[PDB]
Amino acid sequence: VPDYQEDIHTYLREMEVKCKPKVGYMKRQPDITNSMRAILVDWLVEVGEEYKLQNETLHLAVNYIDRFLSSMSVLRGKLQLVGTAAMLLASKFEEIYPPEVAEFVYITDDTYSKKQVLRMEHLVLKVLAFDLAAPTVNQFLTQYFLHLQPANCKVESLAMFLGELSLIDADPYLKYLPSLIAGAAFHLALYTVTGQSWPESLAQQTGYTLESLKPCLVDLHQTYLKAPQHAQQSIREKYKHSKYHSVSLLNPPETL
Amino acid sequence: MENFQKVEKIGEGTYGVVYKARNKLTGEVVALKKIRLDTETEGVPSTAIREISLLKELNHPNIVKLLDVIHTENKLYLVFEFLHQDLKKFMDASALTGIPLPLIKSYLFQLLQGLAFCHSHRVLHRDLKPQNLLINTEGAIKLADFGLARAFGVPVRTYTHEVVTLWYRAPEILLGCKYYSTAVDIWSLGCIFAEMVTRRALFPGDSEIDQLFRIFRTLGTPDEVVWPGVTSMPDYKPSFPKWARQDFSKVVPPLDEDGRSLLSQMLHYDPNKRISAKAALAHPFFQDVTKPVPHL
Numbered sequence: 119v120p121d122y123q124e125d126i127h128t129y130l131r132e133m134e135v136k137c138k139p140k141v142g143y144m145k146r147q148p149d150i151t152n153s154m155r156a157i158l159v160d161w162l163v164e165v166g167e168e169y170k171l172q173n174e175t176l177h178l179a180v181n182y183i184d185r186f187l188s189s190m191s192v193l194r195g196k197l198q199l200v201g202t203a204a205m206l207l208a209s210k211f212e213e214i215y216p217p218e219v220a221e222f223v224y225i226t227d228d229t230y231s232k233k234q235v236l237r238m239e240h241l242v243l244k245v246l247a248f249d250l251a252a253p254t255v256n257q258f259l260t261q262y263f264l265h266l267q268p269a270n271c272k273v274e275s276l277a278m279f280l281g282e283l284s285l286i287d288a289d290p291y292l293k294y295l296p297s298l299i300a301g302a303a304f305h306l307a308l309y310t311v312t313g314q315s316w317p318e319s320l321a322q323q324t325g326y327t328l329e330s331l332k333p334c335l336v337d338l339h340q341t342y343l344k345a346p347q348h349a350q351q352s353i354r355e356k357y358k359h360s361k362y363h364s365v366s367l368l369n370p371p372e373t374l
Numbered sequence: 375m376e377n378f379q380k381v382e383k384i385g386e387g388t389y390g391v392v393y394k395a396r397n398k399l400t401g402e403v404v405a406l407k408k409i410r411l412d413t414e415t416e417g418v419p420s421t422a423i424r425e426i427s428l429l430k431e432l433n434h435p436n437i438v439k440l441l442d443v444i445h446t447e448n449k450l451y452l453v454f455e456f457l458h459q460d461l462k463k464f465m466d467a468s469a470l471t472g473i474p475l476p477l478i479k480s481y482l483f484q485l486l487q488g489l490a491f492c493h494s495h496r497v498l499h500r501d502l503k504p505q506n507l508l509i510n511t512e513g514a515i516k517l518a519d520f521g522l523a524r525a526f527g528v529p530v531r532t533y534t535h536e537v538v539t540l541w542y543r544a545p546e547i548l549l550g551c552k553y554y555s556t557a558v559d560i561w562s563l564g565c566i567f568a569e570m571v572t573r574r575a576l577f578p579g580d581s582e583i584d585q586l587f588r589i590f591r592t593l594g595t596p597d598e599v600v601w602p603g604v605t606s607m608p609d610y611k612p613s614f615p616k617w618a619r620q621d622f623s624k625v626v627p628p629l630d631e632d633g634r635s636l637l638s639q640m641l642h643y644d645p646n647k648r649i650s651a652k653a654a655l656a657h658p659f660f661q662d663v664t665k666p667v668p669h670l
């Protein structure tokens with residue numbers, strides 16, 4: 119435990135409140151819905167796999183997208199341009215090796231031109247005022263993982279999977295802060311794999327009792343049960359792989 | 375744009391130029407960093423995207439202030455507060471005289487406060503060298519040039535291998551560790567501390583292997599006792615000559631016992647045992663610290 123570690127957690131807990139998108143913004147969007155958003159995010163999951171991008175890059179792109187759509191009206195035909203420039207920007211921030219723009223143009227099958235993607239990058243930068251370093255569910259998970267001695271990798275792959283599922287459905291999950299989503303996903307992953315529960319050490323560090331995770335936990339549990347039915351499958355396909363311990367193939371618990 | 379008169383060109387990079395400039399309306403003197411988007415068919419360079427997003431969150435007396443960002447189609451300007459000069463120019467001007475001990479201690483104390491702030495905010499600097507450090511006329515020094523900086527996770531993943539200017543580069547990077555962290559910044563400051571004291575670069579390597587050997591010759595060749603895991607590192611070779619650690623009375627003659635103690639903790643081989651910025655600030659070396667005015 120480095121001595122700046124507690125400071126970083128406190129800082130991120132403050133930043134997640136400042137970088138939070140408006141919870142009800144999709145109502146105010148005339149032409150696009152929670153369902154088009156799910157199709158976009160799911161597609162971004164596949165783009166991430168095709169280019170072997172980090173999970174963090176995916177979580178950042180979604181944060182950028184939701185904040186951009188919080189202040190800007192977008193027609194359905196331009197939604198994917200917003201998502202593509204969001205992914206390009208998260209790639210430049212997060213990745214050692216960001217894909218070049220011509221590759222992002224290729225992955226949309228020439229739906230947009232290079233000039234459009236670059237111009238959308240400019241607009242997204244302007245609208246977010248270059249504040250690109252957002253806390254994500256992913257960053258909070260990796261901190262929570264340190265409370266497992268010894269590390270349980272299966273619990274980790276499962277928590278990551280549950281956290282990534284939350285990105286798909288704006289309703290309910292925009293209602294919860296990344297830190298709380300990460301808390302429920304961690305406890306749910308841990309209970310599923312080891313049958314154990316949210317550690318007292320995390321309850322003290324985060325301030326969340328198991329009780330306070332309950333609302334988000336009920337939601338997350340349902341999402342988990344219904345995952346094979348959900349119209350968007352890219353995350354399940356991704357977490358079937360052995361590098362993830364095929365955790366998407368694990369049966370969820372029936373009750374909590 | 376039209377409200378800045380360019381006074382002089384104070385810096386250059388392949389990215390663009392840095393000018394000392396004056397706001398024509400308010401009279402405010404600024405440093406103006408121009409970044410070429412036009413020769414970028416890739417759009418805004420990730421180096422600029424990181425520099426801006428990270429600087430905007432870092433607000434501290436010992437970190438240079440980003441005043442404004444002007445983003446047009448063909449160009450990107452960063453506007454910073456103007457400071458008298460970088461620590462390299464100061465060191466060259468002081469090469470004959472020497473920098474007074476109370477001033478070296480003040481500057482190290484301040485650099486450590488800026489760095490501890492960066493780290494508490496989950497930013498790695500990764501280019502700490504004298505030309506990226508800025509001093510004003512009132513005795514302040516500030517971290518600058520966040521172009522190589524990165525937000526890091528807890529715990530860290532593998533980040534970019536090519537980071538830190540060779541002379542200031544930590545051994546865990548030279549030996550090719552996949553994981554590195556805040557300790558690389560502490561190592562660079564250690565080198566800068568020694569450089570202020572002796573008026574000479576501590577490890578002036580002309581290549582990666584040369585850099586490594588210069589470090590070994592001074593601190594001794596690391597073994598599994600002082601640095602567990604070192605012989606297992608990707609670029610480690612068992613054929614490396616084994617040199618013995620020199621006495622610090624040889625390395626930094628002017629330094630007192632407290633100074634030598636701090637420097638050696640900043641140069642510890644094992645990144646895990648290397649002193650943190652927070653802990654460095656609490657070291658006895660700083661108990662008398664004052665803020666003297668430099669001579670320019």
Ligand SMILES: Nc1ncnc2c1ncn2[C@@H]1O[C@H](COP(=O)(O)OP(=O)(O)O)[C@@H](O)[C@H]1O
Pocket residue numbers: 384385386387389390392405407438454455456457458459460505506508518519520521
């Ligand atoms: N705020 C400033 N005040 C005075 N000089 C500066 C300032 N910022 C940069 N400079 C000068 O210009 C330099 C180059 O700019 P820097 O920010 O380091 O970016 P780069 O090294 O990528 O060009 C520094 O070495 C410094 O001497």
Ligand SMILES: [Mg+2]
Pocket residue numbers: 505506519
């Ligand atoms: Mg520089």
